Each structure stands twice: as structure tokens, then as C-alpha cells.
Design a protein around this ligand. Structure first.
Ligand SMILES: [Zn+2]
Lengths: 69, 358, 28
């Protein structure tokens, strides 16, 4: 229903920056906009998430129940 | 020489230079500086220590070290009849269990009392976990930016007993402390793996079957330590890992020194050719201890007939088998000396940890 | 009679909008 508190694969706390990342990504859409024309590497690095395949995978792909309900 | 060489401690920090990150931070959290608890990547250099000991320290720091998590006392989640129908107790409990906490006190108990008296979906953040127990928090134990479930309009959520539970990450992953970020052997040459002919290989020039590396670089990340006290937290984590390993090894040592007295952990048979077979069976023991014992017994007895361990996933135990051309008490004292070698190595590791970080 | 109305969905809608305004206590 939300971005997991920690990355499922390794347990890095991506939930710390999940709330910031959601709105930062939204504002980054509004300056680029039919799926995903963006690249979020800079936004993710700025939050402090390392170059981990798992954490970036679960951060940018996890659905939010508020967006769909 | 020294075993644990200089350490590299670099915390993970929010780069506010990015306009979107700063704008979002101040818009929803009113955040302009670094969070009170930040993840720290600790990269370590180990020289003159076997791969088994370094990997055992890594495994302990990963899941075999005791750790704290936030749990809800049974009956804490008020079923009630106004609570949000979507925020189930299981979901919120899973959210709260995995909020990393740097808790120095176990008596802290938090309560979540959030009401949505408005027409919008209200999101419950970790800053809503107010504390009513014992000592007031001089410094927060968790970041206030964690997203706990959202509340539909007119709905609430009341959880009144959120306490701190102690456990190891092997049993429940919510206690996992250190996440792996690097592991390499510095004394083994590496191929250029970007080449086509070496792309299917690991990269190391020596085959793993015939390689005995003694120089390792280990990288671990701790998910939340206080920002002003990073070094002391890293010191405590590493020292506690060493203490845990030493304590378990001493638990094995007691079984060893009770060898004449009957015990079902250890049995001894003198089979045919003066060889004595020692089978050490310990329940709820991991590959860390078995690998340490095998490696150090093999180092102390190079001419051994057979040393091996197996932690079968079922039967949930470590079974270590030693066969040697020696009498029962000679074998026992060799194994005792090998355990003393393990204790010496990890005590030296703790000494180096104290020397280095400070 | 109540079981006919309490399981009626518009009562939940009517209740949840009274809770937002605060006309009724949040709980039951
Ligand atoms: Zn991860």
C-alpha cells in the first residue's frame, strides 16, 4: 500500500526518504511531462540511497494505495 | 602487525543541493538539515586474518547480533469501531517493526493516536509516534519521516503500547542490523572483468577451491545511528559483534572441557586406527560458528584426518565432526587450543576496534 | 430494524461525514 519501510531485499531503510522521494518525483514529472519519461537516478542519489539495485528497484516501482484509491 | 587496519566511516546524507529534494523536504516535513539518525557505510580492512573469521563477523553483524525493534504489545492495537478499515493491525505492525531505532533504553513505550477530522487522506508519519514511558527522549531513536499508513477521511488509528523488543535478526528479520555493501580479498589478484574472455568468471585469479585469502576488505552499512555520535555507535556495534562471537565460542569451550563427563552435545569414539572421532552437536547454531571451528581446527591440525561441519536447514543444529590420529584427550586439548586461538583472534579484533575508531 | 439500517452503506457514508464535521463522536 506504501513504499516499504525498508528495502525488502537487503533491509536498507528507504522508508526514511520515501515520503520526500514521492513528492520530489512528482515535481520532477511536472517538469518533464505514457509511463516513465524520467530518469530518477539524481533524485535517488540526492536522498542518500546508495547505488544498490534492490533499494532503487523497490523505491521507484512500489505502488502507493493513495494514488489508486 | 595489526589485524584490523584503519576504518572508513562515511554516513549517508541528504543532498539538499538538489532543488526537488529540498523543496519536498521543507514542504512536507519542514526539513532543512540532516536527519537525526543517518545510515553509515563502514568499510574495514582486515589483514592476517582468515576469511572464516571476517565472514563470521559480517554474518553476526548482519543478523546474529542482538538488536532492538518497535513492536506492539498484544491488545495494543485498539480494534475499536472508528479505526481506519484499511490500516490493518498486521500492516501497521509490519510498518512499525522495520522502523530502524537506535534505542539505548528498553523501557521506552510509544503510542500512536491519529485522527483524520478532515476530508483528505491523512498520512501518519513516524513523527506521530508520541512517547509516554519513563525517560523523555533527549535524542530521537527513529527518524520522523517514516510513512506509516494513511487514514481515510473521518477514520482514526489508535495503537497504545508500542514497546522496544530485543532479538536477533536470524529469527526475525526486523532485527537485522548491518546490510552488506562490500566484500573483497585484497591479496588475490583480479582479472579485468570488463573484458569478454573473463566476463563469465568471478574475476579473482585464484580458484576459490585452492585460495586461502588472509587480507580482506569488508563493507557494512548500519541503518540508523545518531548523527553526532556515529563513531561511538560503530565502535559499539563492532565490539558487540566480537563479544557475541567470543561468547558463543566459549559456550562451545565448556562442552569441550566437559569431555569426560557425559553430555549429548559431544560424543567420542576411538574407531580403528588409533583415530578418535569427536562429534559436536549444538542446537540453534549457525554456519558462523561451524565455519570458524572447522577453519581454526584445520589451521591448528594441518595433518588432520577429517574436519567438517554441517548446518542442515532442518534439525536446526550445527554438527561438527573431527577425526584425527590422536587419543581422545590429545584431540580434546588440540581443539581447546584451537578455540583459544579463535578467542585470541577476536579479542585482538576488539582491541583493534578500540584503537582505530575512537 | 437497526440491522437493516446499520448495514445500509449510506449510513456509513452519513456517519463518516458526521465524524469529519464532528457532529458525532469519532468512535461508536
Ligand atoms: Zn536494498
Amino acid at each position: 500500500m506504501l513504499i516499504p519501510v525498508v528495502c525488502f531485499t537487503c533491509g536498507f531503510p528507504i522508508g526514511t526518504y520515501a515520503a520526500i522521494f514521492d513528492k520530489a518525483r512528482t515535481e520532477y514529472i511536472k517538469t518533464k511531462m505514457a509511463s516513465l519519461q524520467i530518469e530518477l537516478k539524481d533524485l535517488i542519489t540526492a536522498l542518500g540511497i546508495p547505488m544498490r539495485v534492490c533499494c532503487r528497484t523497490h523505491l521507484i516501482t512500489t505502488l502507493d494505495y493513495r494514488k489508486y484509491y | 602487525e595489526k589485524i584490523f587496519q584503519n576504518v572508513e566511516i562515511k554516513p549517508f546524507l541528504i543532498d539538499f543541493s538538489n532543488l526537488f529534494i529540498k523543496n519536498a523536504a521543507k514542504k512536507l516535513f519542514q526539513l532543512e538539515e540532516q536527519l537525526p539518525l543517518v545510515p553509515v557505510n563502514v568499510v574495514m580492512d582486515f589483514k592476517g586474518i582468515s576469511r572464516a573469521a571476517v565472514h563470521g563477523l559480517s554474518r553476526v553483524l548482519q543478523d546474529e547480533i542482538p538488536n532492538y525493534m518497535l513492536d506492539i504489545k498484544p491488545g495494543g492495537y485498539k480494534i475499536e469501531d472508528s479505526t481506519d478499515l484499511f490500516m490493518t493491525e498486521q500492516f501497521i505492525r509490519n510498518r512499525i517493526n522495520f522502523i530502524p531505532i537506535y534505542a539505548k533504553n528498553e523501557t521506552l513505550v510509544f503510542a500512536l493516536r491519529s485522527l483524520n477530522n478532515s476530508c483528505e487522506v491523512k498520512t501518519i508519519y513516524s513523527r506521530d509516534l508520541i512517547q509516554v514511558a519513563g525517560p523523555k527522549l533527549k535524542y530521537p531513536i527513529f527518524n520522523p519521516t517514516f510513512e506509516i499508513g494513511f487514514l481515510q477521511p473521518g477514520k482514526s488509528l489508535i495503537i497504545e503500547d508500542i514497546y522496544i523488543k530485543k532479538g536477533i535478526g536470524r529469527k526475525h528479520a526486523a532485527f537485522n542490523l548491518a546490510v552488506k555493501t562490500h566484500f573483497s580479498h585484497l591479496d588475490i589478484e583480479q582479472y579485468p572483468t570488463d573484458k569478454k574472455e573473463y566476463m563469465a568468471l568471478s574475476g579473482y585469479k585464484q580458484s576459490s577451491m585452492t585460495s586461502d585469502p588472509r587480507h580482506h576488505r569488508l563493507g557494512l552499512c548500519f541503518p540508523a545511528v545518531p548523527l553526532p555520535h556515529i563513531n561511538q555507535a560503530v565502535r559499539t556495534y563492532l565490539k558487540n559483534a566480537c563479544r557475541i562471537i567470543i561468547g558463543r565460542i566459549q559456550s562451545i569451550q565448556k562442552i569441550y572441557e566437559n569431555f569426560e563427563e557425559p553430555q549429548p552435545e559431544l560424543v567420542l569414539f576411538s574407531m580403528d586406527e588409533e583415530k578418535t572421532k569427536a562429534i559436536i552437536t549444538i542446537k540453534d547454531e549457525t554456519h558462523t560458528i561451524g565455519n570458524l571451528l572447522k577453519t581454526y581446527i584445520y589451521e591448528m591440525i594441518p595433518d588432520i584426518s577429517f574436519v567438517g561441519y554441517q548446518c542442515v536447514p532442518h534439525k536446526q543444529e550445527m554438527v561438527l565432526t573431527i577425526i584425527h590420529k590422536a587419543s581422545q584427550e590429545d584431540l580434546i586439548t588440540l581443539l581447546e587450543k584451537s578455540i583459544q586461538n579463535i578467542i585470541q583472534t577476536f579479542q585482538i579484533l576488539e582491541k583493534n576496534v578500540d584503537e582505530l575508531i575512537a | 430494524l437497526l440491522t437493516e439500517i446499520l448495514l445500509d452503506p449510506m449510513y456509513d457514508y452519513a456517519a463518516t461525514v458526521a465524524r469529519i464535521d464532528g457532529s458525532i463522536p469519532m468512535h461508536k
